[PDB]
Every structure is written in structure tokens, then in C-alpha cells.
Amino acid sequence: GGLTCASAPQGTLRILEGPQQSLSGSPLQPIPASPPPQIPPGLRPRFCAFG
Amino acid sequence: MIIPVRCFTCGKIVGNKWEAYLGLLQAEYTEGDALDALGLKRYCCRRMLLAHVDLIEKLLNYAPLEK
Ligand SMILES: [Zn+2]
């Protein structure tokens, strides 16, 4: 138990978690565009001129 | 608040048509067809009943006597 000074280390291992990327890199999934306003069907001339 | 007696633009009596309008809409008419079945031909008359917000039923939930 003299606890002498040992030599300098050769290198460094570093352990850390890696993320999973099987999900991302996929084609994007955007929010679907709301439709442009379309005229309602069944619009008729309700007003007829008097006389 | 309460349905106007006359239309604002022309003086057509529209105050007697509110309960008829609600009974037509509860009988599954379109709002355009329900305004046709009341004889509201000019769109001045027709917005008076189409756009009416009836605040008196909300304003009578605070009815005081509750008795
Ligand atoms: Zn009118």
C-alpha cells in the first residue's frame, strides 16, 4: 500500500447512450392543409323580383 | 336581447316570426328554406332573423325570485 505514482494513460474510453434513429429520417408527416372554401351545392335564386 | 318588432331597414313586422323560425329549424329545415317559409324575401328582413342572438334566455337564468 505504498501508493506510488503510475505512468501516464494511453487513451480514453467514453461510454454514453446513443439515440435511436430508426424512427426519424422517415418522410415528414405535416399537418394536412385545410381545404379552400368551396361553393355549397344547391344554391338557387330564392329572390324573385316583385311584380 | 329580444327579437326586434320591425326590421331595421324596411318596416316589416319580424317580431312574430321568431318562434316560427325556431320551430322550422327544429323540424330540420335549412336556414335558407326556413327563411323562405316565413316570407322573408329581402335580405334586410332575412338578416334580422338569421343573425339574431337571443340574449334574453341567458339573461333570465339570473331570474331573481327562483320560487
Ligand atoms: Zn326588411
UniProtKB/Swiss-Prot annotation, chain A:
It comes from the Eukaryota. The modification Phosphoserine is found at residues 26, 34. Residues 29-41 have a biased composition (Pro residues). Signal peptide: none annotated. It is found in: Nucleus, Nucleolus; Chromosome. Residues 18-41 are annotated as: Disordered. Component of the RNA polymerase I (Pol I) complex consisting of 13 subunits: a ten-subunit catalytic core composed of POLR1A/RPA1, POLR1B/RPA2, POLR1C/RPAC1, POLR1D/RPAC2, POLR1H/RPA12, POLR2E/RPABC1, POLR2F/RPABC2, POLR2H/RPABC3, POLR2K/RPABC4 and POLR2L/RPABC5; a mobile stalk subunit POLR1F/RPA43 protruding from the core and additional subunits homologous to general transcription factors POLR1E/RPA49 and POLR1G/RPA34. Forms a heterodimer with POLR1E/RPA49. Part of Pol I pre-initiation complex (PIC), in which Pol I core assembles with RRN3 and promoter-bound UTBF and SL1/TIF-IB complex. It is in an antisense orientation to and overlaps the gene of the DNA repair enzyme ERCC1. This gene overlap is conserved in mouse, suggesting an important biological function. Belongs to the eukaryotic RPA34 RNA polymerase subunit family. Component of RNA polymerase I (Pol I), a DNA-dependent RNA polymerase which synthesizes ribosomal RNA precursors using the four ribonucleoside triphosphates as substrates. Involved in UBTF-activated transcription, presumably at a step following PIC formation. This is DNA-directed RNA polymerase I subunit RPA34. The gene is POLR1G.
Curated annotation (Swiss-Prot), chain B:
Keywords: DNA-directed RNA polymerase, Metal-binding, Nucleus, Transcription, Zinc. GO terms for cellular component: cytosol; nucleoplasm; nucleus; RNA polymerase I complex; RNA polymerase II, core complex; RNA polymerase III complex. Gene3D superfamilies: Homeodomain-like. DNA-dependent RNA polymerase catalyzes the transcription of DNA into RNA using the four ribonucleoside triphosphates as substrates. Common component of RNA polymerases I, II and III which synthesize ribosomal RNA precursors, mRNA precursors and many functional non-coding RNAs, and a small RNAs, such as 5S rRNA and tRNAs, respectively. Belongs to the archaeal Rpo10/eukaryotic RPB10 RNA polymerase subunit family. Zn(2+) binds at residues 7, 10, 44-45. It is found in: Nucleus; Nucleus, Nucleolus. InterPro entries: RNA_pol_su_RPB10, RNA_pol_suN_Zn-BS, RPABC5/Rpb10. It comes from the Eukaryota. Component of the RNA polymerase I (Pol I), RNA polymerase II (Pol II) and RNA polymerase III (Pol III) complexes consisting of at least 13, 12 and 17 subunits, respectively. Pol I complex consists of a ten-subunit catalytic core composed of POLR1A/RPA1, POLR1B/RPA2, POLR1C/RPAC1, POLR1D/RPAC2, POLR1H/RPA12, POLR2E/RPABC1, POLR2F/RPABC2, POLR2H/RPABC3, POLR2K/RPABC4 and POLR2L/RPABC5; a mobile stalk subunit POLR1F/RPA43 protruding from the core and additional subunits homologous to general transcription factors POLR1E/RPA49 and POLR1G/RPA34. GO terms for biological process: regulation of transcription by RNA polymerase I; transcription by RNA polymerase I; transcription by RNA polymerase II; tRNA transcription by RNA polymerase III. GO terms for molecular function: DNA binding; DNA-directed RNA polymerase activity; zinc ion binding. This is DNA-directed RNA polymerases I, II, and III subunit RPABC5. It comes from Homo sapiens (Human).
